[model samples]
Target: VVALGLDFGTSGARAIACDFDSDRSVSVSVTFPKTSQNWPQVWREALWQLLTQIPADWRSRIERIAIDGTSGTVLLCDREGQPQTEPLLYNQACPIDLADLADWVPADHAALSSTSSLAKLWFWQQQFGALPPDWQILAQADWLSLQLHGCSQQSDYHNALKLGYSPDRERFSKNLLDSELGALLPVVHEPGVAIGPILPAIAQEFGLSPDCQICAGTTDSIAAFLASGAHQPGEAVTSLGSTIVLKLLSQVAVSDRLTGVYSHKLGGYWLTGGASNCGGATLRQFFPDTELESLSCQIDPTKKSGLDYYPLPSRGERFPIADPDRLPQLEPRPENPVQFLQGLLEGLTQVETLGYQRLQDLGATPLKRIWTAGGGAKNAVWQQLRQQAIGVPIAIAPNTEAAFGTARLAAFGLAAFH
Candidate 1:
């Protein structure tokens, strides 16, 4: 038998089918259309395209299927899986005022911010008021799974949190339940729980077993976190991409919306992290790889840059500081370019240090080790600088792909159903 995990990301989709016994795996991926007025349709086709791309030989052996998508990408759909309206993009957030839900939404609730995850629901209702007859609200992962299992009632807690589902209580929030949108909420489940079996027609089309179980899934970031080889408390993953993001597994749930921090429930444990605006994108605008490498080696990691700089592409910051109007602090450019680069790298490293420190300060476990991912993870100089500032062992993640993590989720379900 085999377990398949499909990841539907913002730009593309990927499938990874692993040996049921944990010995081998296969992969297939396809990019979404560069430009599409119909993203849901693009996602639908990407799903079928990914399944079709999987090798014919591995299809029949598949036993479990799980998927992850961009969190907060909600859809208004019919009970029979027809879209009632186009999805609200997760990144194009519409702010939700916390006072409106103060009755039930706690003061420190993550959703009560300007970067609201649940706001899309209210935005949809405002743009296209009220739920239509025979309609249901589903997250990107929820409705996409419906196309396979034909159930619109189930969703994983990770995806449902953005929609006001409370994993702490194992149900939709009382305030939301009282709202017109609440009745449309999907039944929330843990990420790896078995939800249902694949449709017979889909199974036949892919040459798979009809018994292949569909499992609950999470958001893209969480999937990537799972794929990172960090499970012990305090171990974390730091994405050094255009921005710095830190995720840690801890027994203590932490939430400080002021700093853009929150916890996502994962079984008995909690997944907590924060994102910062500082990373490689700011440096690249000035120097190329050769200069970055050449200048980085000239600096001593043991010494501090004393730059007092805040690296960002532009004004504004998050994580350690949630001030939107915060200005980028790149001043006192030294006559030496090498020193300038070192200062920039140092500023970036400090942001990460502050991010982890803030999370731990808010009650997460002290960071143990950091498994780094993203383009900046490969920079040896930056790694050395980060080690000095963060005071933790740092290394590149063995697998950063969401598909790998989703496959792990599928494998967990495989054992559950077995």
Candidate 2:
């Protein structure tokens, strides 16, 4: 038995097929056009191309399919599920009328942000006060998933959170329900719940079995978390990319605007984490990738760099310490470039440690094992230094692909929660 996962992301679209027993997988991908006026068409073609690229032999064996897309991306659709407007990309922030949110949303609710999914809908509503009665709201993945299921507008909590759907409450927040969007709201589901079998048209076109089920999907970042090896509570996954991000699974949801912490519901637990301005970007500011590796190799992993500093790309940071106008403290330079590199690494480690501690202090599960991902995860010396400083086992994530994570969601949907 096998399951399929399709991930639609900013860079491209990818599809993965995973064998239920062996855990081995094969994937295919296609890039997006560099510039485009119609993204939904781009998305549609990409989905079809991805399905065609799958090895013909694997089609019949596929039992379930799921999707994950960038969070907050949205599309307005007609009753026939055709796009009524171009997609609102996740980062496209627009002006919002604060008066529209006077009731249920607290002053600091994440949805109040100018770029949130809720804000996008409001942006559209403000432009055209009365949408056609047949209008429907679909997340980036929702329309794609519906193309397979053939009908019914639905969404998962991860995609709905930015639209003020509270996972704990399992309903749209009061602000959303009270808004003009009530008729367009979708029926929300837990990510990975099976929606229905593939539509006959899609099955026939792709040579897929009619029995193949279409499952609920999640946001790209959440899918990446599901793709990692952090299943047990207290186990965390930290992305060492341009910036550092830490996520821990806990029994309770954690949210703190000061620290920029928030939680996404994951089955019985909550996936909670925050992003930090301190990470590889600061390292890159001083050294290239080659220099980073060569310098990292020369540093002694066991010994402390003995540098106390807060590293940032600029004069402010939000996580761990919510100090704005905070200066980057890469001073007291050592003559050896390797020592400077090591000192920066050590400082970043301190920030990571403080991040986890902040999460725990905010009532998240105490972080135990950490699975690392992204550019910095490849640096052995840095990983060792982090493990030493944080006093926790740290290893690279087994898989970091969003499609692979969504594939696991497909597999899970096939086995339970029918």
Candidate 3:
């Protein structure tokens, strides 16, 4: 048996087919047109192309499928599931005229941001005039899945969170509905739940089983988290990208949006975490790539820098401590460039340690082990420094592709129905 998982991300669309027994997989990715006038049409073609790229025999064994897309990417559709507007890319800011109206939402809510999915819908509603009763708002993944399932308005909680859906309560926020955008919201479902069987025509076209199921999907980041192989409450995943992010699995939801902390429901558990502006971005300010690579090798990984620097690239700190005007403290400069780099790494490590501690203090599960991902995960010397500073076993994530994660979700969903 096999399952299919699709990822619709900013740059491209990818499909993965994984066998139930061997855990083997095959994948294909197609890039989006850089100058396409019709993005939604391009995405549609990409999905079919991905399916056809897979081996015919492998496609036949597919039992369940799930998809993931960039967080907050959304579009409007008619009753027939045809696109009514261009997809609002995840980063597009909302109209300035709609600024004050967002205040009606709770302070610190995820939807308070200008680029939030709710903001996009509100902008579209204002720009396009009133939405018809038959119109629906769907996240990118939800709309793509609808093509296979034939008809239904459904979304998973991860994608719906930015649309003002309350995963904790498993419903639209009363305030959101009261704000008057409720009618356009999709019916939300938990990730991996079976939405329905694929349409007969789609099944036949793809050479899939008639009974193959279509499962609800999640946002790309959440799907990547699911791939980390951290199944227990205390295990965490720290993404050391341009910024530092910390996520811990917990028994209860932990939310403190002021400090950039929020929770995503995962099965019976909650994936709780925060983001920090202090990370590789800060490192780059002092050392360019060539210097960073060469200087890092000269540092003593076992020794503590004791430099007492809060090495943020700019004037602000977001997580563990939420001070917007907080200034970077790279004072008491070291004469040696390698020592300077070591001190900066140590400071970032301190920030990471403090982040996890803050989460624990805020009632998250105590962080036990950490799985690392992103650009910094490749730094061996930095990894050693992280392990020593945090006093925890840290290792690179087994697999970081969101498509593989969604494939695993499909596999898990298939097993549950048995």
Candidate whose lDDT is highest: 2
The true-versus-predicted C-alpha distance at residue 59 of model 2, in Å, is 1.4
Residue 98 of model 2: what lDDT? Answer: 59
Candidate 2 stretches greater than 4 Å from native: 106-108, 413-418
**TM-score computed on alpha carbons, candidate 3:** 0.91
| lDDT (CA) per prediction | 0.81, 0.85, 0.83
- Give lDDT: candidate 1, residue 364: 94
Ranking by lDDT: 2, 3, 1
Task: Supply the global lDDT for candidate 1.
Answer: 0.81
Question: Judged by lDDT relative to the true structure, which candidate is superior, 1 or 2?
Answer: 2
The Cα RMSD of model 3 versus the native structure comes to 2.9
Q: What does candidate 1 score in Cα RMSD to the true structure?
A: 2.6
Question: Which digits, one per residue and each the tens of the lDDT, describe model 2 over residues 1-418?
Answer: 5999999998999999999698778999999987789988899899999999999889878999999999888998888898877888987987887567546466666676778888888788878878775688899989889878976678998898878777877887665675678778888998888888899988988899988989998988988887884678888998998999988888778888777788888887888989999988898899999978988889898777677767898889989888888999989888888888888998988888899999999999788899988899988988888887788889999999999989988887423211
Write down the TM-score of every candidate.
0.93, 0.95, 0.91
Q: Number of clashing pairs, model 1?
A: 0
**Candidate 3, poorest ten consecutive residues by summed lDDT:** 409-418
| Candidate 3: tens digits of C-alpha lDDT, residues 1-418 | 5788899887898898989599798989998866666877887888899989999999888999999998888878888888887888887887645455455455656777778888888888788777776688888899889988865678998899888777777887676665556677888888888899999998899898889999999988888787786778888898988898888888777778669788888877888888898998988887788889899888888776668888888998889999999999998888988888888888888888999999998899888898999888878898898888788799999987888889888778423211
lDDT of 3 at 323: 96
